[PDB]
Ligand SMILES: *[C@](O)(C(=O)NCC)[C@H](C[C@@H]1CCNC1=O)NC(=O)[C@@H]1[C@@H]2[C@H](CN1C(=O)[C@@H](NC(=O)NC(C)(C)C)C(C)(C)C)C2(C)C
């Protein structure tokens with residue numbers, strides 16, 4: 303038992319991290335097969351026109367270091383906000399992998415990197431407003447977020463920028479930003495965030511699986527009446543699809559999803575009254591139903 | 605910016621995990637050079653006498669799987685509560701490494717494993733009562749906790765058992781339990797835990813580095829008067845050694861350690877009043893001064 307914010311084992315991704323240097327800019331790249339992926343703002347020279355900027359580059363302007371081994375760029379292209387550098391060497395540590403664009407509410411592990419070297423790994427959620435509350439300093443651009451399914455690394459995030467609120471914005475691995483953000487230094491605001499309701503419910507189920515039951519009650523609620531209270535507390539609407547996803551957890555604990563909603567409603571209306579759930583004095587919303595099941599049942603990855 | 609419970613990149617340890625099977629018992633082992641380390645209760649047959657139990661084993665009773673490759677045991681010995689299996693093959697992925705017995709208050713990353721396969725990684729502290737609040741299911745015995753310094757993996761923990769409170773107990777990699785625990789099914793109680801004061805202070809400094817300042821005040825306190833309030837709230841005593849360790853953070857933020865103690869005192873006496881610090885509504889104590897500096901300055905590992 304116990305319940306922790308668990309990241310995926312990061313080794314498969316560590317083997318893909320490289321340093322990309324061009325001009326005075328150094329950041330991280332992702333080396334899969336013979337392509338290095340990195341944020342396009344690595345290129346030389348607000349309101350830049352990256353097409354103009356890139357047509358002016360030569361391959362030899364791109365310094366790619368994989369450890370103490372320089373990789374030479376034999377080609378380059380831009381795909382949305384990512385730059386793709388063709389190199390003459392296929393990464394021998396390339397895992398089996400996919401690129402996935404995730405939905406808000408979904409979680410992933412971030413391998414924070416500086417100068418191509420991994421610094422740490424932690425678990426993130428994509429917020430409803432398409433930011434992530436990460437931990438990123440200058441030099442971390444190009445660090446990636448990922449999930450692992452059996453043996454396959456699903457890359458879903460690459461880091462680009464920090465918003466004035468101290469939260470983070472980036473792209474999928476095909477260079478499309480999550481949310482309304484653009485990779486230029488112009489005024490941009492995240493958007494009002496909301497709490498991921500289905501995830502809070504998943505985490506209450508984790509608490510029950512783990513022996514916290516104090517927040518349960520005998521009441522029930524209608525999805526309709528629950529969502530009325532949710533909106534008042536800035537919670538995302540709970541859909542029937544969410545209820546269905548919460549099915550496996552509801553069945554393992556014997557607590558009807560709608561009964562768990564009654565508990566959450568009472569927790570929203572009354573607060574926690576100096577008590578904690580799973581070591582937290584806040585309602586935690588960065589565990590998906592899948593996260594809870596994986597950690598409470600012990601799924602591994604080969 | 606941002607501040608997250610960050611684990612070390614786990615790849616160097618992932619390459620060392622193996623499955624050890626003996627009789628009907630399967631758990632994880634740690635393969636470094638030509639030795640596999642695992643908990644000694646993997647052996648056949650409360651109040652067992654493991655010396656008697658082990659003299660009755662043969663090498664061929666030990667099934668060690670490294671992936672889809674069986675390793676054959678050519679020797680075995682017991683060192684405290686760990687079993688050491690000599691195998692005929694040196695692990696080619698053996699990182700540079702050390703075994704370290706850590707002090708309570710120190711943090712480490714845990715690579716949770718089942719059947720030799722990594723499940724996830726998360727950050728833990730050794731509690732003052734020498735338990736860890738982990739996330740461990742049946743099959744996780746032999747998963748290890750570690751820190752990484754530059755290129756060196758410092759192994760500090762191997763998992764053995766769960767206590768009735770849902771917390772965890774284990775050994776260093778030389779098989780010595782942390783705390784008063786023994787690897788037999790007899791009544792054992794953890795001991796009253798306390799909050800790691802120097803770590804809470806480190807985390808308040810992380811909050812300041814990151815732009816939370818609301819909890820600061822103009823007051824100061826004496827170490828003596830602080831510790832009187834700490835004891836009342838079940839906090840560990842703060843020593844002058846702790847104050848010195850907090851020096852670098854105090855200097856970078858310009859807040860005297862003893863001034864930060866005044867803030868903590870006021871936070872203990874008044875609570876947080878519905879406010880949060882670094883996303884938490886509790887005073888967080890599983891970040892060391894070193895953790896804070898590493899994450900707020902971007903140290904990496906090659
Ligand atoms: C990233 O480029 C990097 O690490 N590069 C190494 C040289 C860096 C990561 C940032 C730095 C601090 N925390 C992070 O996550 N990203 C950028 O520098 C990014 C690049 C420039 C400006 N960038 C920012 O993140 C800036 N933020 C904004 O300007 N934000 C708004 C106002 C446009 C929304 C800051 C101010 C943090 C440098 C571009 C967006 C292309």
Ligand SMILES: *[C@](O)(C(=O)NCC)[C@H](C[C@@H]1CCNC1=O)NC(=O)[C@@H]1[C@@H]2[C@H](CN1C(=O)[C@@H](NC(=O)NC(C)(C)C)C(C)(C)C)C2(C)C
Pocket residue numbers: 303629630631645740741742743744745764765766767768772786787788789790791792793
């Ligand atoms: C570990 O042996 C394992 O994973 N083995 C694979 C077959 C297992 C890990 C435990 C299981 C649940 N959570 C965990 O961390 N450890 C044990 O089974 C351990 C071994 C037996 C009994 N063990 C326990 O952890 C037991 N706890 C106690 O008996 N605790 C007290 C009362 C002695 C303090 C439980 C009840 C959890 C099985 C020995 C201690 C040798």
